[PDB]
Design a protein. Structure first.
Lengths: 356, 356, 356, 356, 356
């Protein structure tokens, strides 16, 4: 039973509170992740600490305290940190791939589809994707977030089963553990209400990320990065911290994604593809397309019906309107001949469509 | 209570039987060694596997199965393996220094002293010395030994308290474990006898190395490299394999080293230095020397006598006869001004001398 | 017309007088050497600067001024320098191989043969050998030499055609260039006499190295490392500095090597191998051996005659007396079966023998 | 949704009724199988036609009609046929591994486990296993079966989801299609009764194989090998021939396999492993073993309890009694050190055990 | 005087110690075997090295060092190795037939007869049988033997006159040849005693195989595979290694085979067939059988008695009891018409019977 796990590592976990990255803890976590990878699971890593790597590489210069210094250090430390991740993961014979993403890219339909395709290719080819935020075009308010909303968005994009947030605390406590000897860790959370937001107050950003991930049907686990064997225990289901259960199922998330906006296009499908879609629930091939009406772009939701005009599905288009019109009625192997590029052999995937 | 430990790693331990080095086992062993190093102990590493590193670096070419190919692969793999060791040890903030030694150097009187000085400097500066065999001038019969005797020689040179040999087998068995269900591991050995050599039949080389180390007053341990926490348990004193106890004391080994050969020269010492040598057991300084008789090189054993001519000690000279005559009667700070080089402030160290 | 060139790089050339290695000049020289290697020639590199690399790697510590500190720095700088050389040479797709040698190894008969075999294998497999001095067992007087006698010995060992010594000066001048405006560079030198030794006074060590190389039949060239295209011009024969012509021919050097000492052994050869040796000047195979009298080691000079007892050659034995006796009269492919190791298919090579 | 499919190809399908293998039909089927393999499924091939390949390779010689000629032709044609399969599959970049099996091997517990392990390794490493019958030790009655019971046994061994039998006819007909114009193909069969055995009378062997596969919880499909796209349509669930539905579920098959015979051994498990087995349903590691009572072999069913003695599971042992006793209480990575071989890190797999 | 020779080739002989098969040595051995085959002799080959061929074919991938990887490699290596053998033997116009055998098959009464029939057919039709071990159902303890006992079993099965074992060592030495200059090769051995077992320490497996072969009346020879013309000299009777003479005669081995177990059945023979069996020592035909008593399978030993009931012979039955009863009293040409298969014209062969 293969599973997809997103591990988010904050700067506190990576550095241990010091001014430089502590490679011992990182190599321990890499050992756990490599054990999981050998077991057959899929691992996605959201990381931070580019500024620390940039400071270390530059010989710790006496830069003025300004956002420009932060941007420069991030620019150097992105390369330095990806190099460090490659070095640590190559011990266990695992390749890694850099992925710089921003929230605006996730908002855009076409950029979202492109990022999802790249991540899926990386995961299929047994390569660990290391995801960070593009700090060259980011703002200070984004910098103070420390890759929490980005972690939730990456978990949604990867179609993961669990999102593990690693912290310095053990999780969520009912009261203050220092003042109250009776304060105890909360093990299971079924709904993020105002009471929880009042209990914990930067745990607020992690709570928002957990809420976002749970509304998409992904379980969220908050634990301490220093706990031995935390990642493996999370995989096996052993309780190690605070667990936020998924509020919905991925089918509901897909329905919300498809029906969130009105369709931006319209296509028509012949009898054979209609029977395949309805009876078997398979994908849609360009051969079955007959007419393409309306103008849209790749990644936008379109409407699929038969010749009679009765709606049968709503699906995410993998090609724009012009490409779909040009390749309509042709075999899947001719697409590269017609367009000069190929996004895949299907026009609408079976997992990106809802049949009504 | 800091201790000196020499860890010997064979090709089978490093590679696991495969064609290339397995970095997971090496990184686990490096983690254990780094824990010991942070605890305040001194670690020396004797290693093999240059041929595997050379094969991997060269893209696994097809060379004829000869000794020239082995020498070339060793030449490339020495650099490759030292790079790997340095990379693995830099995770825990530990520096690594390469040493290449041969049995002829250990047999030589002056080369032994030079190598001991280099190793002592490396250990005093918190740098792990990685010792291998110079395969450029080595023979095939040396190659088939797999650094077994070199480990004992390095343990004697470093003045180690324990010598750890990592193998595939758990240690020494009374009978064949495969055939005899009653055969059990031997925990302690107090004297290597002909029955023991008949019991184990390359375990013979390891037995010879253990005998050499034990006759010099060093406890030897044979255990499996795959056993978790083997190095830490060996340091702590817990039983993990076969233990060969030291048949002699380091004082006896020093006496054997000093009196194994007749003195090659004689020097005269005034009254104050004589009192310091006898009453307090301190070292000998160039100021106290009054006369130098005979011709000898650095490292040779010489006789120290007072003004009256009565023999009072024997000791290993840190300077040859010419330099000793040139710096006799001068302060220790002027040596570099006289000879152009300095081997230290003392002429005969107190730990390299026997007082009689 | 392939040629073998030995390039000696002192610490002044490598560092430029600074405290660290200057990689720009080194990469320029590496570019020239790579051009030569692609042209089809053979390049051997004798290098220095381990102390500078060790200082740079250790973060420039405040070590006391002692020979112990020198050895401590060299132990790390050897690995760092070999890593730098490999990194710079890999730009042009050339592999390098480390070779640590001492004078005593060259003096030894068997170690000389082992080193020559390793160097020949490295040269044959298109790998650049980087030769340095084993500082772990070296003395201060060796350290102050800066690899000049070692460079000459390596040139003799490699059978090179030219030995290029790179300096900071342009070569040898008749008088002091600063004081005398009429002082001019000496272009050709045919004999190192006392006048030249009086003219140049550390140019003396380089003069001794040039004399040693010239007495072995190797042309020596002293030039400035900063001159553009110096190595290529040396290969093409263009005059760039001071040239010391070879006093003898390699045949005379081989005669001196063979007849320097009386033979240490005696073997007998049948009619077919005798005819092959005398008429054709071919090598000697173990099949032709009939009797082996005397005890000797590998690399020592032995006497070869026929059944009649008339001396026909003096050669260098590639096997010791015991191995030669065991493999006498057998085919070349059985040697590994008989001894467990193979030094080659011949007993005495055609280039290591003199037929009288 | 990856699936495992076993495709059985009789000699009639492979040869088309001629005297030699028809490579066009075979390459078409190989194209379909390669499409499935690229889609992500697992394919196992049971094949025949060794005699035809042997006849073709030997130049069609004139042997007498005897079983000895059949055995000789099978001996040559096994190699010839595996070569042909590898050659045809290499067009699509797929590797092929030969597997020769007999019924008696499936009857034996240890041989069954070894064959299952080999097949699982082949499937995991993306290599298509080609399974045939060992004709060197087979009888004529086995030869006349044409690999039907062997196909069912291989489907059971591989844990396949569907077993596709390719024939010359389209499937099972209610009456004789030639005589009766109203005879129609039977699409779904839910139970193999005496009526079906009377309807079809060599379809009887295929009916027996289908019954054997269905009693193990595997759907069976009988179709014509000449139908275009039969394999793909079978994967998609499209009806192409006669379908025999699974009578049971794989859980019942596992229960029958485990409880078919009384346990041949008894082991004891500590508290942590007991909790892992009962609460989480995980595998059993050698660390948790405490006592091993009884004598058994690898692959035999043993009883697992806790210290109190209450039975908690029945499982297939991956090691024999002696190996389990020797590795009891040790870590999984020490097994190779203790035994000299390793069957895996677990003692009883989670899928080979039933918890009661 | 045609002879049957079984040649066993280990992994070390085939590969020379490298990672892949060395085809020059194999082609030389194939040339010698082809010369013997053209001379009119019969050659059987027992071979190893499937793992090396599998590694080479798969592009030398990186699998974990486990028995599962070994089986995975051997699965494709069997096909690759048989292909290589066929390609090398086709140069001299000789066909090759693959056989896969295990010790269990040799222990079985009927599988032994089937394998013997297949081998006899292959030898009679001038086809070289290449025998290996079925690694799909083999164990690790079987793998570590390197086909040593399988060679003896195949020599017994084939009725060979000589068994040749090719090793790296020249044979058996009285003492250690390396340490003792007086140690010399043992030329002839007449009885394997405990002294020889103590002398040789995988030489033990070869000694066990030699003992098994010699107790069956087959001369065994141990020699080096690298010796030129070893196979031809072995055939001619020239001494090349260590020779173990046959302690018994083939008639004694036949008596041991026949009388090792009590008869499983009884048949009655009329007067003419009784006279043919006794006076002329001919085979037994189904026409002469008058009654069959008991139940037994093919290959079991049965008692043959005349009409009076007096025991006259024992013999191995080529048919089971049912077929013997069905074909009793019929001509040899009708057997195929009665049973649907034929094992030969005789019921008990004259070489499988003992007449008393």
């Amino acid at each position: 039973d293969s599973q997809t796990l997103v591990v988010k590592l904050g700067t506190s976990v990576l550095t241990g509170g010091s001014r430089r990255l502590n490679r011992a803890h990182i190599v321990e976590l890499v050992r756990q992740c490599a054990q999981l990878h050998a077991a057959g699971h899929r691992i996605v890593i959201v990381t931070s600490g580019a500024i620390a790597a940039g400071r270390e590489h530059l010989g710790y210069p006496e830069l003025p305290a300004t956002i420009a210094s932060k941007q420069l250090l991030a620019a150097v430390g992105q390369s330095r940190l990806i190099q460090l991740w490659e070095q640590l993961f190559s011990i266990y014979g695992i390749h890694v791939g850099q992925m710089l993403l921003t929230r605006a890219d996730m908002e855009d339909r076409e950029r979202f589809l492109n990022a999802r395709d790249t991540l899926r290719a990386l995961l299929d080819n047994n390569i660990v994707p290391v995801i960070n935020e593009n700090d060259a075009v980011a703002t200070a308010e984004i910098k103070v977030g420390d890759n929490d909303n980005l972690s939730a968005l990456a978990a949604i994009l990867a179609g993961a089963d669990k999102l593990l947030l690693l912290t310095d605390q053990k999780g969520l406590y009912t009261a203050d553990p220092r003042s109250n000897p009776q304060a105890e860790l909360i093990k299971d959370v079924y709904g993020i209400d105002d009471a929880l937001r009042a209990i914990a107050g930067g745990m607020s950003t992690k709570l928002q990320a957990a809420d976002v991930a749970c509304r998409a049907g992904i379980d969220t686990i908050i634990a301490a990065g220093s706990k031995p064997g935390v990642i493996g225990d999370v995989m096996e289901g052993i309780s190690v911290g605070t667990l936020f259960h998924a509020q919905a199922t991925p089918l509901e998330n897909r329905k919300r994604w498809i029906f969130g906006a009105p369709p931006a296009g319209e296509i028509t499908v012949d009898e054979g593809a209609t029977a395949a879609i309805l009876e078997r629930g398979s994908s849609l091939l360009p051969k079955g397309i007959k007419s393409v009406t309306g103008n849209f772009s790749r990644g936008e939701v379109i409407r699929i019906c038969n010749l009679e005009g009765r709606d049968i599905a709503h699906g995410v288009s993998r090609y724009n309107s012009d490409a779909l019109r040009r390749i309509a009625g042709h075999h899947s192997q001719e697409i590269d001949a017609i367009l000069g590029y190929e996004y895949g052999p299907v026009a609408v995937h079976r997992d990106d469509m809802i049949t009504r």
